[model samples]
Target: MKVRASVKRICDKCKVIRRHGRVYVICENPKHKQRQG
Candidate 1:
Protein backbone atom coordinates (compact mmCIF):
# COMPACT_ATOMS: atom_id res chain seq x y z
CA MET A 1 0.00 0.00 0.00
CA LYS A 2 1.20 3.49 -0.77
CA VAL A 3 -0.04 7.04 -0.35
CA ARG A 4 -0.69 9.17 -3.38
CA ALA A 5 0.70 12.67 -3.64
CA SER A 6 -1.75 15.53 -3.81
CA VAL A 7 -1.68 17.94 -6.70
CA LYS A 8 -3.33 21.29 -7.40
CA ARG A 9 -3.75 23.62 -10.36
CA ILE A 10 -4.04 27.36 -9.84
CA CYS A 11 -5.08 30.07 -12.23
CA ASP A 12 -2.36 31.82 -14.22
CA LYS A 13 -4.08 35.09 -13.49
CA CYS A 14 -4.30 35.25 -9.74
CA LYS A 15 -0.95 33.61 -9.03
CA VAL A 16 -2.26 32.94 -5.58
CA ILE A 17 -3.54 29.49 -4.81
CA ARG A 18 -3.13 26.83 -2.20
CA ARG A 19 -3.23 23.04 -2.15
CA HIS A 20 -2.88 20.58 0.67
CA GLY A 21 -2.05 23.51 2.94
CA ARG A 22 0.78 24.37 0.57
CA VAL A 23 0.93 27.81 -0.99
CA TYR A 24 2.14 28.50 -4.51
CA VAL A 25 2.99 31.77 -6.20
CA ILE A 26 4.68 30.92 -9.43
CA CYS A 27 2.03 32.02 -11.91
CA GLU A 28 1.39 35.48 -13.22
CA ASN A 29 -1.70 37.33 -12.09
CA PRO A 30 -3.34 40.16 -13.99
CA LYS A 31 -4.67 41.73 -10.86
CA HIS A 32 -1.38 41.27 -9.14
CA LYS A 33 0.47 42.92 -11.95
CA GLN A 34 -1.95 45.82 -11.87
CA ARG A 35 -1.27 46.26 -8.19
CA GLN A 36 2.43 46.52 -8.88
CA GLY A 37 4.00 49.95 -8.76
Candidate 2:
Protein backbone atom coordinates (compact mmCIF):
# COMPACT_ATOMS: atom_id res chain seq x y z
CA MET A 1 0.00 0.00 0.00
CA LYS A 2 1.10 3.54 -0.70
CA VAL A 3 0.00 7.14 -0.37
CA ARG A 4 -0.36 9.65 -3.18
CA ALA A 5 -1.74 13.11 -3.83
CA SER A 6 -4.49 11.38 -5.81
CA VAL A 7 -5.72 7.83 -6.03
CA LYS A 8 -5.53 7.29 -9.77
CA ARG A 9 -6.68 3.74 -10.68
CA ILE A 10 -6.56 0.09 -9.67
CA CYS A 11 -7.28 -3.05 -11.68
CA ASP A 12 -8.85 -4.75 -8.66
CA LYS A 13 -11.91 -3.68 -6.73
CA CYS A 14 -11.75 0.08 -6.39
CA LYS A 15 -13.44 0.91 -3.12
CA VAL A 16 -12.86 4.55 -2.38
CA ILE A 17 -12.80 4.93 1.37
CA ARG A 18 -12.46 8.13 3.35
CA ARG A 19 -10.63 8.92 6.57
CA HIS A 20 -9.74 12.16 8.30
CA GLY A 21 -10.30 14.08 5.06
CA ARG A 22 -8.13 11.65 3.16
CA VAL A 23 -9.19 9.17 0.51
CA TYR A 24 -7.96 5.64 -0.04
CA VAL A 25 -8.14 2.90 -2.66
CA ILE A 26 -8.48 -0.32 -0.73
CA CYS A 27 -7.15 -3.28 -2.70
CA GLU A 28 -5.21 -5.77 -0.68
CA ASN A 29 -4.49 -7.85 -3.72
CA PRO A 30 -1.74 -8.28 -6.26
CA LYS A 31 -2.96 -5.03 -7.73
CA HIS A 32 -2.70 -1.34 -6.91
CA LYS A 33 -2.85 -0.02 -3.34
CA GLN A 34 -2.79 3.71 -2.78
CA ARG A 35 -4.18 6.55 -0.71
CA GLN A 36 -5.32 9.99 -1.73
CA GLY A 37 -4.53 13.01 0.38
Candidate 3:
Protein backbone atom coordinates (compact mmCIF):
# COMPACT_ATOMS: atom_id res chain seq x y z
CA MET A 1 0.00 0.00 0.00
CA LYS A 2 0.96 3.61 -0.57
CA VAL A 3 -0.13 6.94 0.84
CA ARG A 4 0.36 10.62 0.14
CA ALA A 5 -0.27 14.02 1.65
CA SER A 6 -1.20 17.33 0.15
CA VAL A 7 -2.63 20.76 0.96
CA LYS A 8 -4.34 23.37 -1.20
CA ARG A 9 -4.73 27.08 -0.55
CA ILE A 10 -5.71 30.31 -2.32
CA CYS A 11 -5.53 34.02 -1.64
CA ASP A 12 -6.87 37.19 -3.28
CA LYS A 13 -3.86 39.18 -2.12
CA CYS A 14 -1.26 36.50 -2.62
CA LYS A 15 -0.30 33.42 -4.58
CA VAL A 16 1.23 30.10 -3.59
CA ILE A 17 4.72 29.16 -4.69
CA ARG A 18 6.11 25.73 -3.99
CA ARG A 19 9.80 25.45 -3.34
CA HIS A 20 12.04 23.40 -1.05
CA GLY A 21 9.06 21.22 -0.25
CA ARG A 22 7.16 24.18 1.19
CA VAL A 23 4.62 26.81 0.17
CA TYR A 24 5.53 30.46 -0.05
CA VAL A 25 3.35 33.57 -0.02
CA ILE A 26 3.85 36.01 -2.90
CA CYS A 27 1.74 39.12 -2.56
CA GLU A 28 -0.29 40.19 -5.56
CA ASN A 29 -1.71 43.27 -3.83
CA PRO A 30 1.08 44.67 -1.75
CA LYS A 31 -0.19 45.83 1.66
CA HIS A 32 3.20 46.41 3.29
CA LYS A 33 6.94 46.48 2.63
CA GLN A 34 7.28 42.84 1.74
CA ARG A 35 10.41 40.87 2.54
CA GLN A 36 11.58 37.31 1.94
CA GLY A 37 11.25 34.71 4.69
Candidate 4:
Protein backbone atom coordinates (compact mmCIF):
# COMPACT_ATOMS: atom_id res chain seq x y z
CA MET A 1 0.00 0.00 0.00
CA LYS A 2 1.41 3.33 -1.06
CA VAL A 3 0.53 6.79 0.18
CA ARG A 4 -0.86 8.78 -2.68
CA ALA A 5 -2.39 12.17 -3.04
CA SER A 6 -5.26 10.53 -4.88
CA VAL A 7 -6.65 7.06 -5.10
CA LYS A 8 -6.08 6.14 -8.75
CA ARG A 9 -8.73 3.55 -9.48
CA ILE A 10 -11.70 4.32 -7.32
CA CYS A 11 -13.92 1.86 -9.06
CA ASP A 12 -17.35 0.57 -8.06
CA LYS A 13 -15.86 -2.47 -6.37
CA CYS A 14 -13.30 -0.29 -4.65
CA LYS A 15 -14.08 1.01 -1.18
CA VAL A 16 -12.75 4.00 0.69
CA ILE A 17 -11.85 3.28 4.27
CA ARG A 18 -10.45 5.66 6.81
CA ARG A 19 -7.99 3.74 8.89
CA HIS A 20 -7.54 5.43 12.24
CA GLY A 21 -6.89 8.79 10.56
CA ARG A 22 -5.51 7.97 7.14
CA VAL A 23 -7.61 7.30 4.04
CA TYR A 24 -7.30 4.09 2.06
CA VAL A 25 -8.62 2.82 -1.24
CA ILE A 26 -9.21 -0.93 -1.19
CA CYS A 27 -10.51 -2.87 -4.12
CA GLU A 28 -12.29 -6.20 -3.98
CA ASN A 29 -10.09 -7.34 -6.84
CA PRO A 30 -7.07 -6.59 -4.67
CA LYS A 31 -5.26 -4.70 -7.36
CA HIS A 32 -6.15 -1.05 -7.26
CA LYS A 33 -5.03 0.02 -3.83
CA GLN A 34 -3.83 3.40 -2.66
CA ARG A 35 -4.00 5.95 0.15
CA GLN A 36 -4.84 9.63 0.39
CA GLY A 37 -3.93 11.90 3.25
For all candidates in order, the CA lDDT equals 0.40, 0.70, 0.46, 0.73
- Identify the candidate with maximal TM-score: 4
Off by over 4 Å in 1: 1-14, 28-37
- Flag the better candidate by lDDT, 1 or 2: 2
2 or 4, greater by lDDT:
4
Cα lDDT tens digits for candidate 2, 1-37:
3354787657656677888877877776646677786
Candidate 4 steric clashes? 0
Global fold similarity of model 3 (TM-score):
0.37
- Candidate 4 collision pairs: none
Clashes of each: 1, 0, 0, 0
- Per-residue lDDT for 23 in model 2? 81
In model 1, the clashing pairs are 13-29
Compute the lDDT for candidate 2. 0.70
What's the C-alpha lDDT at position 32 in model 2?
62
lDDT of 3 by residue, 1-37 (tens): 1225333333566666666655555675555223233
Q: Give the Å error, residue 21, model 4.
A: 1.8
